[PDB]
């Protein structure tokens, strides 16, 4: 997935992941916000496709992450009002349901040592999108 | 050829012979970016060798909010030179050096407990960049006009002596006080 821009990679991979209408996309994608340190829900309607494209991209670079790791990857600063701001982990159920959605596409499997890693099928699909963004740039 | 990337460093002349030595632009201090971190705050006259595009970048980080945010001000100077080259077809590096020529107070007054005294060539460029960045900062505190526009307008008006630049109004104010207190 390297050799290309990682910000346009997750946008083109999400379009491929949405055009391939097989993702789970739970029912509460319209009510949940992605973290307790967030004030509003994601502006984009298809945030579950954007996060799934970015999540499978992190597993390509650092396998065996798991839900606890993706919760830390997508964490950020938490404004506490009149108190100083600290780091806050992301959502656990959002990170867990987006990991199981990638497993339904046979792109992610349970890592034998730790959590979940990338499959040879997912590694192939990610490299195909990585070739499309290179030709389109 | 050495450039910022699109804007050439040559053909940038300096009118005042005084500031010709304390303005680092051509043939020796030409870098692709106004960000090198060369430890210029080490000796007495090390900042005189620092490029004025980086000194303009360092002076735009002036508030408790902007401290330690230089890649932002590099982007501001990068976008300001785009507006400068767009408004005036001349070289943006020429507009910045011409702004220092007109924003440098030649004389100042000191308090005695006044008295007009001369201004060193280094304090001219030191105060010119200070007056230029102060005017563009106050012009964008509450305004839809972005900082890249305020910095560009602060520099094109100073390079032309339009008397609308905040630096020109302050430069003429400090001189007329020393003119009456000499």
């Amino acid at each position: 997935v390297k050799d290309v821009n990682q910000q346009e990679f997750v946008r083109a991979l999400a379009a491929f992941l949405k055009k391939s209408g097989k993702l789970k996309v739970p029912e509460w994608v319209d009510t949940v916000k992605l973290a307790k340190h967030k004030e509003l829900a994601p502006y984009d309607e298809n945030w579950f496709y954007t996060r799934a494209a970015s999540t499978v991209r992190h597993l390509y670079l650092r396998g065996g992450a798991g839900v606890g790791s993706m919760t830390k990857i997508y964490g950020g600063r938490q404004s506490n009002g009149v108190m100083p701001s600290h780091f806050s982990r992301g959502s656990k159920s959002v990170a867990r349901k987006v990991l199981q959605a990638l497993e339904s596409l046979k792109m992610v499997d349970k890592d034998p040592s730790g959590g979940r890693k990338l499959t040879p099928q997912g590694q192939r699909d990610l490299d195909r999108i990585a070739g499309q963004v290179a030709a389109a740039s | 050829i050495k450039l910022f990337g699109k804007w050439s460093t040559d053909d940038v002349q300096i009118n005042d012979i005084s500031l010709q030595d304390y303005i680092a632009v051509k043939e020796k201090y030409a870098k692709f970016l106004p960000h090198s971190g060369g430890r210029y705050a080490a000796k007495r006259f090390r900042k005189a060798q620092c490029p004025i595009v980086e000194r303009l970048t360092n002076s735009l980080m002036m508030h408790g909010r902007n401290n330690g945010k230089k890649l932002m001000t590099v982007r501001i100077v990068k976008h300001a030179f785009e507006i400068i080259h767009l408004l005036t077809g001349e070289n943006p590096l020429q507009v910045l050096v011409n702004a220092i020529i007109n924003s440098g107070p030649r004389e100042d007054s000191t308090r005695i407990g006044r008295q007009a005294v001369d201004v060193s060539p280094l304090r001219r460029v030191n105060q010119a960049i200070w007056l230029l960045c102060t005017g563009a900062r106050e012009a964008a505190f509450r305004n839809i006009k972005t900082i890249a526009e305020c910095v560009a307008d602060e520099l094109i008006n100073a390079a032309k002596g339009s008397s609308n630049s905040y630096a020109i109004k302050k430069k003429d104010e400090l001189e007329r006080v020393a003119k009456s207190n000499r």
Partner: protein, 67 residues
Amino acid sequence: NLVLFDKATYDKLCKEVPNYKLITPAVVSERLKIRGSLARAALQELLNKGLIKLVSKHRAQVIYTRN
């Protein structure tokens, strides 16, 4: 100030703005008395047609010019 274009304002945008030296969602918002949201989306339409060009695009700084 203005949130949606009017017949007297929209025609004012399409005839004299493409003739400006600096075209920016901030400089066209001050003289047309329109808000930055409308001024930003309006300049994106002129870029698609071809009346204006694009000098440099960024998060909070989009610089257009004339053909």
